[PDB]
Amino acid sequence: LSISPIFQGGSYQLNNKSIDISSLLLDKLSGESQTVVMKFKADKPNSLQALFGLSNSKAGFKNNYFSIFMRDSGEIGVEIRDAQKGINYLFSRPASLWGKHKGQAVENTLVFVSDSKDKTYTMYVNGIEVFSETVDTFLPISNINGIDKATLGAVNREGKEHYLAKGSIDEISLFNKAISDQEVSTIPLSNPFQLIFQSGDSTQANYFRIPTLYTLSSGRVLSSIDARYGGTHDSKSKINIATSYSDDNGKTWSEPIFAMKFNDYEEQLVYWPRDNKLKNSQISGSASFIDSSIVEDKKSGKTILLADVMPAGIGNNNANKADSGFKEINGHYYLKLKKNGDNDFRYTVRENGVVYNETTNKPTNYTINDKYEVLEGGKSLTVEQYSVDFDSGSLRERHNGKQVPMNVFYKDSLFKVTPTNYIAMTTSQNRGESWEQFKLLPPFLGEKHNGTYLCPGQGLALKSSNRLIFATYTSGELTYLISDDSGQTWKKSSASIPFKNATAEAQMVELRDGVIRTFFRTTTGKIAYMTSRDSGETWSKVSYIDGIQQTSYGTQVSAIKYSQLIDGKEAVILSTPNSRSGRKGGQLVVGLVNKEDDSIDWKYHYGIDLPSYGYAYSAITELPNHHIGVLFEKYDSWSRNELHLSNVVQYIDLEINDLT
Numbered sequence: 311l312s313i314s315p316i317f318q319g320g321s322y323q324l325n326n327k328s329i330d331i332s333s334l335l336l337d338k339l340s341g342e343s344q345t346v347v348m349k350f351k352a353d354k355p356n357s358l359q360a361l362f363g364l365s366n367s368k369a370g371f372k373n374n375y376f377s378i379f380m381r382d383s384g385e386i387g388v389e390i391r392d393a394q395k396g397i398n399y400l401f402s403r404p405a406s407l408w409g410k411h412k413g414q415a416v417e418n419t420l421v422f423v424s425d426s427k428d429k430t431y432t433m434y435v436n437g438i439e440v441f442s443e444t445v446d447t448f449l450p451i452s453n454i455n456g457i458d459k460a461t462l463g464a465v466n467r468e469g470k471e472h473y474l475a476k477g478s479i480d481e482i483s484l485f486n487k488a489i490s491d492q493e494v495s496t497i498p499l500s501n502p503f504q505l506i507f508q509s510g511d512s513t514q515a516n517y518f519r520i521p522t523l524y525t526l527s528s529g530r531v532l533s534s535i536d537a538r539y540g541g542t543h544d545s546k547s548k549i550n551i552a553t554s555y556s557d558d559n560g561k562t563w564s565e566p567i568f569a570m571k572f573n574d575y576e577e578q579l580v581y582w583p584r585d586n587k588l589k590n591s592q593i594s595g596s597a598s599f600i601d602s603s604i605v606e607d608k609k610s611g612k613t614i615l616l617a618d619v620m621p622a623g624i625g626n627n628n629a630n631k632a633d634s635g636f637k638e639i640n641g642h643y644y645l646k647l648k649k650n651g652d653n654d655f656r657y658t659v660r661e662n663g664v665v666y667n668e669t670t671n672k673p674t675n676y677t678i679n680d681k682y683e684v685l686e687g688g689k690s691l692t693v694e695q696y697s698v699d700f701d702s703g704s705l706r707e708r709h710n711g712k713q714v715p716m717n718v719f720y721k722d723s724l725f726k727v728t729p730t731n732y733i734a735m736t737t738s739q740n741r742g743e744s745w746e747q748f749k750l751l752p753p754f755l756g757e758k759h760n761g762t763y764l765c766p767g768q769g770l771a772l773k774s775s776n777r778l779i780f781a782t783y784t785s786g787e788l789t790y791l792i793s794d795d796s797g798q799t800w801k802k803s804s805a806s807i808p809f810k811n812a813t814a815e816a817q818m819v820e821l822r823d824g825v826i827r828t829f830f831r832t833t834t835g836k837i838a839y840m841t842s843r844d845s846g847e848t849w850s851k852v853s854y855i856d857g858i859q860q861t862s863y864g865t866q867v868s869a870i871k872y873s874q875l876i877d878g879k880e881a882v883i884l885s886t887p888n889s890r891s892g893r894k895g896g897q898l899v900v901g902l903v904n905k906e907d908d909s910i911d912w913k914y915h916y917g918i919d920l921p922s923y924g925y926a927y928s929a930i931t932e933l934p935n936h937h938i939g940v941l942f943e944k945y946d947s948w949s950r951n952e953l954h955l956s957n958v959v960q961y962i963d964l965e966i967n968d969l970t
């Protein structure tokens with residue numbers, strides 16, 4: 311750093327008894343700007359505990375203190391309080407911490423900058439900015455009226471220990487300066503994780519959800535994700551699908567590119583509001599992609615990626631359930647279009663993108679190209695792009711002066727698709743270095759049924775054939791999409807399930823040649839499964855796994871077949887929260903296959919981090935060196951308290967010995 315600390319100490323054990331460092335620190339504090347750098351572990355935290363306190367300990371001044379505190383939910387924050395000044399600041403962010411990794415307490419690196427010149431308080435944990443708050447009336451942390459105690463592991467209020475901590479502070483430094491963002495980035499870290507996608511990267515999305523991982527035949531490992539712009543909200547929103555790969559067993563990852571992108575709205579990095587008045591603000595006029603899945607095709611060598619596609623302002627809540635968006639004429643399916651001013655859909659898209667008029671069966675002078683863009687007489691039509699802002703105190707979506715190709719999925723398009731959900735595919739011929747323009751899959755359940763929903767994660771490539779399968783769900787069933795010709799044509803295999811309107815997110819493993827077990831989310835608090843023994847043509851009844859708990863609403867479960875024997879048996883690995891309370895208590899569960907009947911003995915449970923720390927959607931893959939890569943949402947993506955968090959989708963590397 312550009313300056314030396316005014317105080318430095320270390321190896322403090324916090325065992326429900328605070329340590330007083332007043333004599334060491336208080337007379338060193340000077341000026342109105344301070345930086346606290348603290349390396350600390352808390353693998354068995356109390357419900358709510360202070361790591362560091364500056365306080366007025368005298369009778370009558372219980373509300374005059376500064377503290378850095380944490381919760382056993384993983385939340386970190388500060389309080390800055392002075393009764394005389396009439397100031398009570400509370401800043402925090404959920405899901406900011408690690409507890410344990412590979413059975414070992416994680417050294418978290420916390421940097422808090424209190425900057426009087428910019429009147430801004432900024433918190434970083436593990437190299438990640440979790441909050442930055444500017445105020446009209448700045449309160450320097452050591453200018454609190456009557457401060458007489460500096461405390462580790464509690465806050466001294468009126469002579470008593472409040473917020474008693476269990477943990478350790480291995481290193482703490484304080485500086486009479488607000489160190490710059492640049493200098494913060496030089497502070498050495500001890501992180502157990504890495505980021506593949508992150509705020510400020512090439513996607514310019516401040517948020518990410520729905521990770522995938524897939525190990526390709528070359529040894530490259532590929533990842534996809536929802537790059538979500540309008541906070542962490544599902545569609546309707548602006549969301550693109552981004553990808554990144556690793557050629558060195560997950561050690562380093564490429565700068566992300568888009569596999570599927572719309573441009574009716576600008577790609578903006580926005581700090582979405584988290585207060586109770588505005589947090590449900592939602593980009594409402596943008597088209598989007600959501601929930602991707604990846605597979606590799608042995609035949610063509612192509613990588614194939616599917617995702618749901620949502621027209622402008624559409625998501626699963628308002629998608630028309632009674633319309634596929636296609637017209638069936640003969641045995642063929644054609645995308646329907648509504649033209650500006652018509653109250654019905656009087657057009658279809660035919661072969662070679664010719665826009666046809668259904669009311670008179672004439673072709674028009676309009677065509678749809680390979681990017682689903684509108685051409686008139688071969689000339690590209692355009693629309694004006696939108697940008698979003700909260701400058702007026704609420705969400706505004708408005709034209710920004712920039713023209714972009716007119717797309718049938720856009721709000722401002724001359725021709726518009728049916729307001730319902732679709733599935734598209736794209737392919738890469740260079741293992742994720744570039745992606746083709748996407749194609750819509752045809753409808754599978756008839757003219758008047760909305761599309762199914764893609765199960766995020768991996769598709770399945772069968773070992774002994776060229777069959778490709780992508781699981782999807784809808785009301786009352788899993789609908790497996792099957793291709794035997796490199797994704798050129800698809801057919802459905804329907805498998806009834808005993809829940810109506812479920813989110814039956816399903817992932818498959820091939821237990822042995824032609825035998826597929828599918829594990830899926832339900833509404834019962836238990837993960838279910840079904841088996842196919844004819845490469846997906848037919849499916850067994852549904853069974854449930856005991857020994858793992860989910861919530862009533864459930865969470866995606868990822869699943870792989872391990873290439874190596876474990877305890878002499880074939881192994882399957884599941885990744886899921888294990889909790890009936892929320893999306894937390896992340897585990898990998900190792901199951902050994904009983905060859906006699908293909909039953910699975912769930913023998914090992916690996917705790918990814920604390921039971922109380924967040925874990926939601928996840929991706930797992932066997933890396934080429936036989937380690938396991940896990941990319942997962944490290945927060946509760948269901949909780950309405952943990953919306954719009956940045957850099958919570960994280961990646962770790964595990965070995966089987968860590969799991970057993």
Ligand SMILES: CC(=O)N[C@H]1[C@H]([C@H](O)[C@H](O)CO)OC(C(=O)O)=C[C@@H]1O
Pocket residue numbers: 520544545600601618625626763813947948
């Ligand atoms: C297409 C879509 O909306 N998919 C979303 C899915 C869906 O909303 C479901 O109906 C309710 O779980 O929910 C979740 C979720 O965190 O639970 C993530 C998906 O991105």
Ligand SMILES: O=S(=O)(O)[C@]1(CNC2CCCCC2)C[C@@H](O)[C@@H](O)C1
Pocket residue numbers: 523524525526768771870871873931932933934935936
């Ligand atoms: O067996 S595959 O289905 O082709 C696959 C990869 N197998 C290799 C075997 C050799 C070690 C690394 C993983 C498993 C799925 O989880 C995908 O990652 C693709």
